[PDB]
Design a protein around this ligand. Structure first.
Ligand SMILES: [K+]
Ligand SMILES: [K+]
Ligand SMILES: [K+]
Ligand SMILES: [K+]
Ligand SMILES: [K+]
Ligand SMILES: [K+]
Ligand SMILES: [K+]
Ligand SMILES: [K+]
Ligand SMILES: [K+]
Ligand SMILES: [K+]
Ligand SMILES: [K+]
Ligand SMILES: [Mg+2]
Ligand SMILES: [Mg+2]
Ligand SMILES: [Mg+2]
Ligand SMILES: [Mg+2]
Ligand SMILES: [Mg+2]
Ligand SMILES: [Mg+2]
Ligand SMILES: [Mg+2]
Ligand SMILES: [Mg+2]
Ligand SMILES: [Mg+2]
Ligand SMILES: [Zn+2]
Ligand SMILES: [Zn+2]
Lengths: 76, 135, 17, 91, 24, 113, 97, 252
RNA sequence: ACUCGUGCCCCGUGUGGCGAAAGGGAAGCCGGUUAAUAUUCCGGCACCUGGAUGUGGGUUUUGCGCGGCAACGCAACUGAA
């Protein structure tokens, strides 16, 4: 797994043919939002502190991608 | 007396250009603010001309006889002086310690060094300067 | 009159197969 | 603080092998464990590596010598005789 | 580098040259 | 907490290839991990010291890392240390110069007749 | 030869000298050296390098007959020395011969 | 009875020589054109120790006159040689320690080592620590040289044989006592299976000629004829005399 | 290279196999699961070797990269016998 620094590169990663899916994980105790995209070789993570760009970023993603919300206590 | 004049031929001893032979353009026997030691400003050869034979064609002769120059400032402790000299009027004030602060100025200086060194080599003088050292 | 030989070792010649 | 009267380096052998044999081995142990001044660099760092090999810790040179001394009297005499034989006849 | 490594690179060049001929 | 461990492979003997170290797992257990041997630094070809600027790996691992990471930008980049390269350049020049003076002196001062 | 030990001690007392290899080379570069001494057991590559610089700057060179150990003692020091330069001769005539 | 101990050693099963740790044998170069008409030089690269031997060895690198490569040799080291030293070999080499030249190019009284018995066999005589041979005289009309050997004997050798100036390094190794059984054991453990050694007079008659008896004794003369049978030669073979040597030894 | 195997051209001092589940040696970790297997099954997250190959970037207008006094650095940055 690898980390992505800025937002512009993370958007360009999600516009790739081998991008299978994406998900959103939020940690309320430490007030973080994590965006993860599943590619052929690696899983890319982007970490955000605020919450006024998360929905802005969410609508900027390509519409054909599948985005989930990572429920607590995922079933086996 | 003094032998580190402005026409002396020396050999570089350390660095990426170790083993090449250079001609001194301007000696600086007292250290400046940067480089507080004895140093010099030189121009040299990085890729020597290739071997040539009486059986080749004119087109192949001219393609093999070309030089790649370079410029540098070096400590005196990283030089080895020789007994040869190369006094060329084309290299008088090509580098003056401020061309090393602008990349555009470096390219212009090296463009001039190539033109002058090339004509002297074709004339047929200072063959020891244009011959690489085997070590 | 004989051919020149640049080595002192004799090798078996090559023939059709 | 002298801590030994006469046995010296051969005090590791206790009361074994006989007095005369301990003396004879003491003569050879002292000279093979000492330091010698290098002939090439000048420093006082030359020790025995193997039974006939002596090496300098500073300038990294090794030399062929005696079993327990850096040079032998027979070799030293021969070098002078060879030097004289060649020189005073050919020069 | 090893000889098998170098053989692969020249093999690709030969295929590309015959294919670019086939293209032309 | 003071739990004992076992090997994870069929070799039960403590050889120079049965190297292990202890870990603790996100499942709260003490286990064993099997590890390789340490790399060795390349040496200079004249004096035999460790070359600076080059990693220490097992021999097969050098086939994958890029070229600029395996060499330094100088004549005899690998395998010579730089002090030795300085000696070679000076020695080559001085011996070549004495060759010319010995030739000229021998030809002129002794074959003038 | 025999009198070098006498002449050398006088230059130490009156004139000025520089000891060592790095400083001797710097003196030759400046062109203010008048006489250098080279010990017997100095490495032959270093010995040839010193002599080539002297040819360039035209200063005489004298080959001392002792090791680096006794070239230092001849200068009154307590450490070894393999080469040296003389910047000025004082009340001595070591430059005459 | 049964086969005695010194007969079993010729079979060679547990009595062979240990050779894992030895790298090469010590020989001159093969005699060639350069050494017959001029000289060539090589560089000493290392001085090494090989087990089972005194007398350290030297690794020397030469250059090929006919091919673009270099060749590494293994000589025996003379006292005074060092790493980084040039040595010379041939007819026109100089009279310096470590050089190799034919005996016809040396004056009388010089000392050499690793002397060939015949020109080209690469060295047979005087190759042990602290030993040498001495040149005695010449005979130019027929081409022979007289030499003296470490045993004290005299020999005549063709003048084209080669030798190395100096004495073999290794000094006076045999001067200090071994002083311990373990020290002798370590010495032979890298040579051959010959240690320890049981006395024949302490075996049974089936084992050795000195046999048994109600006291330990030999029972007959211990000097054995030269022309005896294998299994009988146990003791002093073809002994000219016996007893403590009082005076000087007339033979030379 | 073959029209298509057939035909050409170089180098040559040397030229077999078996023999180690403790010697040398390319590459995998965590969680879960069965009555009985798991570093092998399920989930997640990686790596190595071999083979084909296209985009992005790099170099070259006078042909095969720049920087540092230096030790050396940088994502690349021709190289047969
Ligand atoms: K590096
Ligand atoms: K029998
Ligand atoms: K033999
Ligand atoms: K035994
Ligand atoms: K016994
Ligand atoms: K008794
Ligand atoms: K008895
Ligand atoms: K194995
Ligand atoms: K099952
Ligand atoms: K491109
Ligand atoms: K670049
Ligand atoms: Mg062996
Ligand atoms: Mg009994
Ligand atoms: Mg019997
Ligand atoms: Mg009998
Ligand atoms: Mg009996
Ligand atoms: Mg097998
Ligand atoms: Mg194994
Ligand atoms: Mg692959
Ligand atoms: Mg190359
Ligand atoms: Zn030393
Ligand atoms: Zn080195």
């Amino acid at each position: 797994p690898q980390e992505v620094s800025d937002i512009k590169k993370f958007i360009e990663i999600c516009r790739r043919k081998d991008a299978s899916s994406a998900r959103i994980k939020k940690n309320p105790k430490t007030q973080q939002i994590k965006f993860k995209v599943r590619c052929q070789r690696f899983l890319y993570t982007l970490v955000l502190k605020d919450s006024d760009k998360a929905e802005k970023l969410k609508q900027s993603l390509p519409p054909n991608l599948q985005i989930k919300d990572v429920p607590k206590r995922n079933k086996r | 007396m003094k032998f580190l004049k402005t026409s002396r031929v020396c050999l570089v001893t350390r660095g990426r250009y170790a083993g090449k032979k250079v001609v001194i353009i301007q000696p600086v026997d007292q250290g400046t603010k940067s480089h507080p030691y004895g140093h010099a400003l030189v121009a040299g050869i990085e890729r020597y001309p290739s071997k040539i034979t009486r059986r080749m064609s004119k087109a192949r002769i001219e393609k093999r006889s070309k030089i790649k120059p370079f410029i540098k400032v070096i400590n005196y402790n990283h030089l080895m002086p020789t007994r040869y000299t190369l006094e060329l009027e084309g290299l008088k004030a090509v580098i003056n310690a401020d061309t090393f602060k602008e990349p555009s100025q470096r390219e212009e200086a090296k463009k001039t060094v190539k033109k002058v060194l090339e004509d002297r080599y074709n004339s047929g003088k200072n063959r020891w300067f244009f011959t690489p050292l085997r070590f | 009159k004989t051919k020149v030989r640049k080595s002192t070792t004799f090798h078996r010649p090559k023939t059709l197969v | 603080s002298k801590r030994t009267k006469k046995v010296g380096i051969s005090g590791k052998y206790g009361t074994r092998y006989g007095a005369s044999l301990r003396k004879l081995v003491k003569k050879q142990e002292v000279t093979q464990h000492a330091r010698y001044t290098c002939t090439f660099c000048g420093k006082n760092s030359v020790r025995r590596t193997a039974v006939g090999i002596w090496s300098c810790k500073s300038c990294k040179k090794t030399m062929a010598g005696g079993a327990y001394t850096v040079s032998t009297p027979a070799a030293a005499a021969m070098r002078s005789t060879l030097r004289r034989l060649r020189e005073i006849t050919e020069a | 580098m090893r000889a098998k490594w170098r053989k692969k690179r020249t093999r690709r060049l030969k295929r590309k040259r015959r294919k670019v001929r086939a293209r032309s | 907490a003071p739990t004992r461990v076992t090997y994870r492979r069929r070799n039960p003997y403590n050889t120079t290839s049965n190297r292990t170290r202890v870990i603790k797992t996100p499942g709260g257990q003490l286990r064993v991990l099997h590890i390789k041997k340490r790399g060795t630094a390349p040496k200079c070809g004249d004096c035999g010291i460790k070359l600076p600027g080059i990693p220490a790996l097992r021999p097969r691992e050098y086939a994958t890392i890029s070229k600029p990471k395996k060499t330094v930008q100088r004549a005899y980049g690998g395998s010579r240390c730089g002090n030795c390269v300085r000696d070679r350049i000076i020695r080559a020049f001085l011996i070549e110069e004495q060759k010319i003076v010995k030739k000229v002196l021998k030809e002129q001062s002794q074959a003038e007749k | 030869a025999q009198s070098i030990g006498a002449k050398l001690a006088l230059v130490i007392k009156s004139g000025k000298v520089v000891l060592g290899y790095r400083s001797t080379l710097k003196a030759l570069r400046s062109g203010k050296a008048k006489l250098i001494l080279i010990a017997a057991n100095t490495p032959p590559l270093r010995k040839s390098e010193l002599e080539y610089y002297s040819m360039m700057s035209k200063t005489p060179v004298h080959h001392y007959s002792g090791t680096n150990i006794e070239l230092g003692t001849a200068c009154g020091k307590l450490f070894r020395c393999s080469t040296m330069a003389i910047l000025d001769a004082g009340d001595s005539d070591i430059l005459a011969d | 009875g049964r086969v005695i101990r010194n007969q079993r050693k010729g079979r060679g099963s547990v009595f062979t020589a240990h050779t894992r740790l030895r790298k090469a044998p010590a020989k001159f170069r093969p005699l060639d054109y350069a050494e017959r008409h001029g000289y060539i030089r090589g560089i000493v690269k290392e001085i090494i120790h090989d087990p089972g031997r005194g007398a350290p060895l030297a690794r020397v690198v030469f250059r090929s006159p006919y091919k673009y490569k270099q060749i590494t040799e293994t000589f025996i080291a003379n006292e005074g040689m060092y790493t980084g030293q040039f040595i010379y070999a041939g007819k026109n080499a100089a009279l310096t320690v470590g050089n190799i030249l034919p005996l016809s190019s040396v004056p009388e009284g010089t000392v050499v080592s690793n002397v060939e018995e015949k020109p080209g066999d690469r060295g047979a005589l005087g190759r042990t620590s602290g030993n040498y041979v001495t040149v005695v005289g010449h005979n130019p009309d027929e081409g022979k040289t007289r030499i003296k050997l470490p045993s004290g004997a005299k020999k005549v050798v063709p003048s084209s044989s080669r030798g190395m100036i100096g004495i073999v390094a290794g000094g006076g190794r045999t001067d200090k006592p071994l002083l311990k059984a373990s020290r002798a054991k370590h010495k032979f453990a890298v040579k051959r299976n010959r240690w320890p050694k049981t006395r024949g007079v302490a075996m049974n008659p089936v084992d050795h000629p000195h046999g048994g008896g109600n006291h330990q004794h030999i029972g007959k003369a211990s000097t054995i004829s030269r022309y005896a049978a294998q299994g009988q030669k146990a003791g002093l073979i073809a002994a000219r005399r016996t007893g403590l040597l009082r005076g000087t030894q007339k033979t030379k």
